[PDB]
Paper text:
[name] is a protein expressed in the skeletal and cardiac, or striated, muscle of vertebrates that plays various roles in muscle structure and function. Encoded by the gene [name], [name] spans half a sarcomere (the basic contractile unit of muscle) and has various functions including preventing sarcomere over-extension (Gautel and Djinović-Carugo, 2016), acting as a molecular ruler for thick filament formation and as a hub for numerous signalling molecules (Kruger and Linke, 2011, Linke and Hamdani, 2014). [name] domains are only found in the A-band region of [name], where they are arranged with Ig domains in a pattern termed super-repeats, which themselves are repeated. [name] domains have a characteristic beta sandwich fold, with a core of hydrophobic residues as the “filling” between two beta sheets that pack against each other face-to-face.
[name]-3 and [name]-11 are found in the non-repetitive region of A-band [name] near the tip of the thick filament, [name]-20 is in the second D-zone super-repeat and [name]-49, [name]-56, [name]-85 and [name]-90 are located in the 1st, 2nd, 6th and 7th C-zone super-repeats, respectively. [name]-20 is at position 6 of the D-zone super-repeat, and [name]-49, [name]-56, [name]-85 and [name]-90 are at the 11th, 10th, 6th and 2nd position of the C-zone super-repeat, respectively. Alignment of their primary sequences show an insert in [name]-20 extending the loop connecting strands C'/D to E by five residues that does not align with residues in any other [name] [name] domain. The extended loop in [name]-20 results in a unique protrusion from the back “side” of the domain, not present in the other structures presented here, nor any other [name] [name] domain structurally determined. All domains determined present a typical [name] domain fold, with the extended loop connecting strands C’/D and E in [name]-20 being the largest difference between the structures. With this extended loop only present in one further domain ([name]-25), this could be a candidate for a (semi-) unique binding site on a [name] [name] domain for a putative ligand, analogous to the “KTLE loop” in Ig-159 (A169) required for MuRF1 binding to [name]. The structures increase the coverage of [name]’s primary sequence with experimentally determined high resolution structural information by ∼ 15% and nearly double the coverage of A-band [name], with the first experimental structure from the D-zone ([name]-20). The variant in [name]-20, Leu18237Pro, was identified in a patient also carrying two C-terminal truncating variants inherited in trans, whilst Val22232Glu in [name]-49 was co-inherited in trans with a truncating variant in the kinase domain at the A-band / M−band junction. [name]-20 Leu18237Pro was solubly expressed but caused a 16.9 °C reduction in domain thermal stability.
Residue numbers in the entry: 3 to 109
The structure:
Amino acid sequence: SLPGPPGKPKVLARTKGSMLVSWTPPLDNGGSPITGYWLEKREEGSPYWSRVSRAPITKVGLKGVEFNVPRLLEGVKYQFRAMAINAAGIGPPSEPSDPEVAGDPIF
Ligand SMILES: [Cl-]
């Protein structure tokens, strides 16, 4: 009924204050269409997971569903996890992304 976990998110772009995060839809949507996703972040120095958007994320980019996470702090290390939403509710989280630091990218 609930959807399965989305794929492990990947950071596709970063700046000092943002990261473009992308993930694949779950293999099992639970039997009803997924209507959107929640994305949460966790930083170094805190155990908590925090939603990064006020409304569900739906944008499909080149590699998966994606969102540019704002309000990151330069030099801080973050991970992200995504949850799918369907008619039954919010599914379990993806595996967390590999850690990434907010900073500008290697040229
Ligand atoms: Cl980089």
